[PDB]
Amino acid sequence: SHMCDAFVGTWKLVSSENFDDYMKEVGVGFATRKVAGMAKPNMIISVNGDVITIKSESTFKNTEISFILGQEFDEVTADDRKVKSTITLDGGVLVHVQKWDGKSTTIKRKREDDKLVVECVMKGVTSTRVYERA
Ligand SMILES: O=C(O)CCn1nnc(-c2cc(Cl)cc(Cl)c2)n1
Fold this sequence. Notes:
It is classed as lipid binding protein. 13% of the residues lie in helices and 57% in strands. The chain is mainly beta. The protein has a single domain, classed as Calycin beta-barrel core domain (Lipocalin). A ten-stranded antiparallel beta sheet has the order 4-3-2-1-10-9-8-7-6-5. The chain starts with 8 loop residues before the first strand and ends with a strand. Bound molecules: 3-[5-(3,5-dichlorophenyl)-2H-tetrazol-2-yl]propanoic acid.
């Protein structure tokens, strides 16, 4: 109850740093990187009971995940990886781990001031994506 209150809402991407390099490290191909990197998605976060839903709506590829914290699920990513995901809350940060093909990437979502800051890590490469309220 009230676990993700400050995440709930509709958010719009306003800045990105190092996302191309993050995608390269993940293994995303050229054409997907170029088109995906243009997108300015809206991220829509909602909670109903124990179920959290995160939607991403963009000109590249709409996605939607629903999950319970700590409970692994199947996810098809925007770049079409078939991953096994687990999302937990760690000290007020949503921590999303994706596993596929013996690889792993972690996406952290945090509230900072009036922004939602998304940090994506693959090995030594980090990308920071900043969202504001839509
Ligand atoms: O939500 C955000 O801004 C960042 C979290 N995030 N959402 N989508 C992706 C993504 C998309 C593509 Cl096409 C490739 C790869 Cl490796 C990751 N990462």
